[PDB]
Amino acid sequence: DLTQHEIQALTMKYNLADAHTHQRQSASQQSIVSRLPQLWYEAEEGLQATYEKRFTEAFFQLHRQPTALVKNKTMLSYAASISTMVAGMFLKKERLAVTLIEPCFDNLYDVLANMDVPLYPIDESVFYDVDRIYPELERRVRTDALFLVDPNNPTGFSLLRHGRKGFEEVVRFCKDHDKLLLIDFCFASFTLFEPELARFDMYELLENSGVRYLAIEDTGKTWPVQDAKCALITASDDIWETVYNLHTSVLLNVSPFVLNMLTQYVRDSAADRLASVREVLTRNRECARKTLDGSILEYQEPVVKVSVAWFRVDHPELTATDVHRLLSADGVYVLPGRYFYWSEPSKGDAYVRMALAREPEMFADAMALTRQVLDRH
Amino acid sequence: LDLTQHEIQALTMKYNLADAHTHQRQSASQQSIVSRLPQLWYEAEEGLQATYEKRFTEAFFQLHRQPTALVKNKTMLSYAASISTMVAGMFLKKERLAVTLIEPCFDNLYDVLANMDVPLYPIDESVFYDVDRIYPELERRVRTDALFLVDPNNPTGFSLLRHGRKGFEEVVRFCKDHDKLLLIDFCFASFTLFEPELARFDMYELLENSGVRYLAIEDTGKTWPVQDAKCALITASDDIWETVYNLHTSVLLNVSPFVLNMLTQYVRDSAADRLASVREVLTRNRECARKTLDGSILEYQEPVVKVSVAWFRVDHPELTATDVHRLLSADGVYVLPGRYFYWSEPSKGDAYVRMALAREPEMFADAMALTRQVLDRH
Ligand SMILES: N=C(N)NC[C@@H](O)CC(=O)C(=O)O
Numbered sequence: 037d038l039t040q041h042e043i044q045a046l047t048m049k050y051n052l053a054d055a056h057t058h059q060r061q062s063a064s065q066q067s068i069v070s071r072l073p074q075l076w077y078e079a080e081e082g083l084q085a086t087y088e089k090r091f092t093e094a095f096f097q098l099h100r101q102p103t104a105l106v107k108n109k110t111m112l113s114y115a116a117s118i119s120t121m122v123a124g125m126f127l128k129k130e131r132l133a134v135t136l137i138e139p140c141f142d143n144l145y146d147v148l149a150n151m152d153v154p155l156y157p158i159d160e161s162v163f164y165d166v167d168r169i170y171p172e173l174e175r176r177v178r179t180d181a182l183f184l185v186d187p188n189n190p191t192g193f194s195l196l197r198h199g200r201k202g203f204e205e206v207v208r209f210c211k212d213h214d215k216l217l218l219i220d221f222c223f224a225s226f227t228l229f230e231p232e233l234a235r236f237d238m239y240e241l242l243e244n245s246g247v248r249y250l251a252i253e254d255t256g257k258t259w260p261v262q263d264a265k266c267a268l269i270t271a272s273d274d275i276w277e278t279v280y281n282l283h284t285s286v287l288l289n290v291s292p293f294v295l296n297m298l299t300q301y302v303r304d305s306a307a308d309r310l311a312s313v314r315e316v317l318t319r320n321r322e323c324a325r326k327t328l329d330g331s332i333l334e335y336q337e338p339v340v341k342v343s344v345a346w347f348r349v350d351h352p353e354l355t356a357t358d359v360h361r362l363l364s365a366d367g368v369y370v371l372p373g374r375y376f377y378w379s380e381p382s383k384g385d386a387y388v389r390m391a392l393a394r395e396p397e398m399f400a401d402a403m404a405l406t407r408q409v410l411d412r413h
Numbered sequence: 414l415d416l417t418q419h420e421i422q423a424l425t426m427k428y429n430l431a432d433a434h435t436h437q438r439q440s441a442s443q444q445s446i447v448s449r450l451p452q453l454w455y456e457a458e459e460g461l462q463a464t465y466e467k468r469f470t471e472a473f474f475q476l477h478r479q480p481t482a483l484v485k486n487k488t489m490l491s492y493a494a495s496i497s498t499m500v501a502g503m504f505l506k507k508e509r510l511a512v513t514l515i516e517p518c519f520d521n522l523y524d525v526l527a528n529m530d531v532p533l534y535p536i537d538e539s540v541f542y543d544v545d546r547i548y549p550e551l552e553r554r555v556r557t558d559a560l561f562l563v564d565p566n567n568p569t570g571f572s573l574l575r576h577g578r579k580g581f582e583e584v585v586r587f588c589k590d591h592d593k594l595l596l597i598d599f600c601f602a603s604f605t606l607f608e609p610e611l612a613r614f615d616m617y618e619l620l621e622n623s624g625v626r627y628l629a630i631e632d633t634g635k636t637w638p639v640q641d642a643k644c645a646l647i648t649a650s651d652d653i654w655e656t657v658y659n660l661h662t663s664v665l666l667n668v669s670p671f672v673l674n675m676l677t678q679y680v681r682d683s684a685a686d687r688l689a690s691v692r693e694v695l696t697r698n699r700e701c702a703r704k705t706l707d708g709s710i711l712e713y714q715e716p717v718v719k720v721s722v723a724w725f726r727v728d729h730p731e732l733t734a735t736d737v738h739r740l741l742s743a744d745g746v747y748v749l750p751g752r753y754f755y756w757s758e759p760s761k762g763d764a765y766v767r768m769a770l771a772r773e774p775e776m777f778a779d780a781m782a783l784t785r786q787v788l789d790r791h
């Protein structure tokens with residue numbers, strides 16, 4: 037019940053629970069907000085397909101996925117969880133069991149379980165050594181589908197630490213062994229413009245390999261758009277028609293006004309190479325790291341500079357549940373890790389997640405209070 | 414293929430009379446809301462999410478005159494009525510419930526539940542025409558443990574409100590007596606508001622008092638010209654509320670507080686003008702369609718409720734709705750053939766055509782003139 041813990045924090049003093057964006061608008065993003073009336077009238081007079089096309093083009097240009105634009109088969113929905121429910125309907129129709137990454141944000145588990153998809157965990161550590169990925173998958177993936185989250189939420193882990201080879205090994209395994217490969221790329225924006233970690237064209241690999249796949253992309257966790265957002269799903273050619281028919285039963289269209297607005301955010305971030313996103317996260321990440329260094333919350337350095345920070349509880353008795361209780365009694369709301377080890381929540385009582393997509397002044401105040409609370413125990 | 418895919422193609426066309434989504438422009442007071450979008454954005458950044466949920470829900474159920482829903486204060490918000498329907502689908506599957514679903518109805522209601530592997534069986538709308546036959550007809554025909562109605566119905570505009578309170582009271586009596594889950598899609602209910610005889614009564618008072626197990630879905634997207642930046646509402650009976658709450662929270666944490674803030678302005682604006690700016694556009698186009706097609710091969714089917722779609726019967730010896738759709742689209746006018754509204758037996762829909770009325774009157778009048786010109790050739 038992550039969302040329910042995030043519902044409570046949304047009312048609270050220092051909400052560091054949900055990863056939704058709550059930083060304010062940059063100077064140039066304020067120029068988008070100021071033009072919302074113009075963007076409204078544009079969408080009212082133009083064609084729906086125009087705003088879909090321009091959003092999809094801007095998005096995959098920023099993310100440097102040109103193969104996705106050549107194939108031109110991506111479908112848009114209100115949110116990544118909606119795209120996930122479309123994938124869930126496909127998994128249920130094919131009666132497939134899923135091997136799902138663990139840890140991962142629990143709402144992925146919850147939505148798939150709620151559509152009665154069988155779920156079996158595979159630990160993130162199977163991906164740490166590039167030359168062991170394939171034999172580890174051969175041992176441990178004993179279902180017809182494999183569902184990854186890359187970069188991962190909450191750890192920031194990514195196969196991109198291995199260049200192309202990590203993903204190539206996963207795709208090799210799934211092709212060789214007739215596995216459907218599902219990948220949630222919602223955190224992939226945080227790799228962009230990184231000298232070593234910037235995502236390559238994933239769709240070139242997925243298409244060239246001929247693997248059966250479903251790939252989900254997102255805007256909501258990248259930009260401060262107050263959850264007025266859009267997610268994207270792309271399927272391999274062999275299942276595209278089935279998935280298309282499932283998708284059209286859910287919605288006809290995303291708001292062309294929202295799409296028009298989102299396109300401006302994407303273009304704005306192309307212009308500043310995502311600086312207004314990255315700099316806010318870096319300031320809060322550094323503040324958390326320096327504030328909590330040496331405390332019972334042991335910072336877990338992520339592969340990718342994602343919008344959440346992950347900590348191990350380094351104490352002989354206290355759990356993450358204890359830590360969450362103590363911090364919330366003083367008005368600071370974090371998430372216990374239980375909410376991420378969906379197959380075995382007690383494993384998550386060793387970890388805590390904090391959201392970084394926050395105004396830095398509020399975040400710094402929350403960090404000062406957090407260390408003061410922790411220092412009493 | 415489904416009606417939504419027909420609507421994707423029509424959305425690329427000038428005379429799109431297919432999707433029921435709102436495509437009329439803004440009223441003068443609605444252009445004021447548009448001018449405040451920057452302030453509505455910054456307000457939602459500074460305020461609490463729960464504040465915008467509460468203010469929206471209050472405005473919505475004040476306009477719809479559903480005070481019981483505000484007392485219970487257990488309604489959950491989602492991106493769209495189909496998303497609320499998928500939450501209902503998750504509950505139906507968890508409880509092994511099959512659904513007796515109204516026919517005709519817009520096909521994605523059938524399709525999305527079928528795509529969730531919910532077993533579905535039709536019940537014809539005519540079961541509800543005679544108030545004193547509703548209960549015995551349901552006893553003889555409903556052989557599932559859930560019953561899913563759409564009221565007012567899409568595409569016919571039919572409503573149990575023709576019977577005052579008694580039609581809904583008989584449906585609820587049946588479902589309570591026989592331990593059935595009652596699901597009701599109220600997305601068209603705004604079109605009853607301020608009607609002297611048809612204005613919806615407080616449905617949640619009846620649902621709560623009866624003790625019936627229920628899921629009730631409400632919508633904004635079909636009412637206001639908000640370019641599908643919208644919100645739907647679902648309310649569950651107390652005995653299933655906790656299960657449904659947990660299902661709902663797996664789908665989304667929150668609707669955009671910016672969108673909620675904006676929608677609240679539209680709801681308040683329509684309270685101030687008694688939905689005049691919505692009703693007048695539909696009236697202008699409904700009357701244009703009726704006058705243009707009177708005596709034509711498209712026979713207007715008068716609805717109980719003045720909903721945002723018009724329903725026509727094909728009155729011709731040989732031509733079907735499929736033929737009419739092809740003939741009109743060949744000349745640039747896109748309507749929906751009735752086939753898919755009869756989701757259990759599409760051949761029954763080959764005698765019907767649906768036209769969307771939530772359109773700019775000038776475009777709609779030009780579409781009607783072109784439609785008449787095509788039909789005048791057969
Ligand atoms: N699959 C979906 N949700 N299609 C859009 C739906 O709004 C169309 C509709 O219901 C109508 O045109 O009356």
Ligand SMILES: N=C(N)NC[C@@H](O)CC(=O)C(=O)O
Nearest residue numbers: 054055143662663664665666
């Ligand atoms: N069931 C859903 N969709 N909850 C909201 C989700 O955005 C929260 C989340 O995934 C995170 O905070 O990382």
